Amino acid sequence: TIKEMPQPKTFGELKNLPLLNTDKPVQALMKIADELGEIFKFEAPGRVTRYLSSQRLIKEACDESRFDKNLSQALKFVRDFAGDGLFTSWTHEKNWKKAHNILLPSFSQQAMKGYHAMMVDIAVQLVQKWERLNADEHIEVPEDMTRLTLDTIGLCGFNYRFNSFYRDQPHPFITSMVRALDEAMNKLQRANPDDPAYDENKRQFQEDIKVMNDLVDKIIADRKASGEQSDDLLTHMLNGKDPETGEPLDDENIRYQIITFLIAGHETTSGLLSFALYFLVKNPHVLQKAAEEAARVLVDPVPSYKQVKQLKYVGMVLNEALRLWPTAPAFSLYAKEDTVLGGEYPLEKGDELMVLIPQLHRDKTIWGDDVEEFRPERFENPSAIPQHAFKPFGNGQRACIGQQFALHEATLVLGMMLKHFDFEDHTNYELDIKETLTLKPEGFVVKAKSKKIPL
Ligand code: HEM
Numbered sequence: 001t002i003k004e005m006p007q008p009k010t011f012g013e014l015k016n017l018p019l020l021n022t023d024k025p026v027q028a029l030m031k032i033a034d035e036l037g038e039i040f041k042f043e044a045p046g047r048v049t050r051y052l053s054s055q056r057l058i059k060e061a062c063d064e065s066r067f068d069k070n071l072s073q074a075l076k077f078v079r080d081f082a083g084d085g086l087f088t089s090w091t092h093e094k095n096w097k098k099a100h101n102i103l104l105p106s107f108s109q110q111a112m113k114g115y116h117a118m119m120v121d122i123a124v125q126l127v128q129k130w131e132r133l134n135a136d137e138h139i140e141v142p143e144d145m146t147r148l149t150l151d152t153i154g155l156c157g158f159n160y161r162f163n164s165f166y167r168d169q170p171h172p173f174i175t176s177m178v179r180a181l182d183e184a185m186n187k188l189q190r191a192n193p194d195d196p197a198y199d200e201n202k203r204q205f206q207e208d209i210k211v212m213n214d215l216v217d218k219i220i221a222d223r224k225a226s227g228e229q230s231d232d233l234l235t236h237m238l239n240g241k242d243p244e245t246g247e248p249l250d251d252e253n254i255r256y257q258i259i260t261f262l263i264a265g266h267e268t269t270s271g272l273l274s275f276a277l278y279f280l281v282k283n284p285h286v287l288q289k290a291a292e293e294a295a296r297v298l299v300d301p302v303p304s305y306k307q308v309k310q311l312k313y314v315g316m317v318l319n320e321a322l323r324l325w326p327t328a329p330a331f332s333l334y335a336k337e338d339t340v341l342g343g344e345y346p347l348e349k350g351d352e353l354m355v356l357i358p359q360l361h362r363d364k365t366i367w368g369d370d371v372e373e374f375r376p377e378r379f380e381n382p383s384a385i386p387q388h389a390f391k392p393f394g395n396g397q398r399a400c401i402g403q404q405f406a407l408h409e410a411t412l413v414l415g416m417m418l419k420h421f422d423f424e425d426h427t428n429y430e431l432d433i434k435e436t437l438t439l440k441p442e443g444f445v446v447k448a449k450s451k452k453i454p455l
């Protein structure tokens with residue numbers, strides 16, 4: 001039999017839209033998922049899609065033969081400034097595959113070995129900042145993490161120094177980026193977009209998009225006039241040719257790739273580091289574990305690519321935090337052809353599916369009766385994890401291109417942090433997750449007491 005698609009309350013023409021009227025749509029969806037189960041329909045004026053939570057359905061949606069990446073309404077809005085960069089372009093769009101081939105090289109084992117040096121340059125600035133702090137002062141976690149992350153990707157990928165640590169006030173780019181994301185998020189809940197109330201929001205949107213592009217222009221101009229021979233993402237965007245077409249990326253797309261790597265290559269990571277640290281502080285013994293592991297592997301003042309690969313446990317911390325709170329909370333698919341999801345739900349071609357990643361990682365049938373617990377050990381034997389049970393980095397051909405960059409950076413820094421400081425939850429911070437499409441702990445602050453070890 002065919003099961004009637006379960007779905008939340010409707011408000012006439014508004015459908016389920018009013019349900020999403022909030023600062024935290026994903027978390028709301030999680031609750032609705034909790035109340036409706038493995039799958040439900042969410043309809044709104046014009047659009048309609050199905051949010052999946054269970055692995056059994058996820059594993060199906062994650063079948064390239066039947067489902068390809070769909071641009072969720074969120075991403076459609078992000079396209080306004082991210083254009084057809086990797087993250088926001090359709091699979092069957094010339095620029096995607098092209099850029100994929102052209103840019104992929106910048107994320108190989110060897111490359112990571114080259115980036116590592118610069119990563120440490122930033123990581124040190126961080127430890128330095130935290131070491132230069134005095135008694136009464138405390139650290140603002142996600143603020144400094146984002147500070148770290150943007151600087152790292154900028155240097156590593158474009159050889160441009162945002163110098164985030166040289167400013168107490170948020171780098172302009174960040175400020176405009178968060179606003180553009182936030183607006184993208186707000187548009188999802190809008191009933192009538194043309195309403196002259198949104199006029200202001202639109203003027204501000206353009207404003208922030210322009211600021212982002214202004215930076216791109218500075219990054220490129222800075223590259224032109226420099227003593228080069230840099231083998232980074234930038235030189236690859238500007239020079240690499242897609243071997244399948246022999247053609248290189250056009251300026252319009254190259255721009256899009258810069259914006260894309262600047263945003264995608266920093267936000268999700270800092271969010272990850274913030275959540276990780278949150279959990280470590282809230283789970284002292286796990287912290288203690290990760291602290292010792294670090295203390296013994298990082299024998300050198302400044303960590304090596306290999307020593308970082310030796311930070312087994314801290315990596316587990318990372319995947320656990322990434323399990324409970326996946327920074328990029330969801331990805332979308334579409335029925336490549338008419339089919340039937342789970343043998344119960346009939347899908348027509350082009351039917352949108354939405355994967356609530358944070359829920360998939362709470363599936364007790366996979367993780368057990370304690371899903372809500374921060375237990376790094378769950379990742380002691382990676383082999384145990386059924387595929388499609390842990391999908392924090394997207395799926396298949398359209399998966400995180402920078403995945404390893406993130407984890408290598410996160411591990412490095414998390415390792416160093418635990419190596420040099422005593423972190424105290426001086427405020428018993430209650431978790432508050434701020435949503436800007438991406439997830440991050442807001443107002444998370446701590447105090448780092450020096451172990452007084454140099455670097
Ligand atoms: C913990 C951090 C990160 C998380 C959780 C994350 C997650 C993801 C996810 C879920 C997607 C797929 C979205 C979809 O299927 O619609 C994705 C795509 C992508 N990510 Fe990441 N990401 C992270 C870090 C990075 C970094 C550091 C870079 C680059 C330096 C990066 C670059 C990209 C790009 C370009 C894509 C588009 C891939 C494509 O569709 O061709 N990501 N990432």
Ligand SMILES: CCCCCC/C=C\CCCCCCCC(=O)O
Pocket residue numbers: 025026074078082087088188260263264328329330354437438
């Ligand atoms: C290219 C720009 C960087 C990527 C920014 C967005 C990253 C991931 C998107 C997560 C979307 C989560 C959707 C929640 C909102 C909803 O479903 O209604």
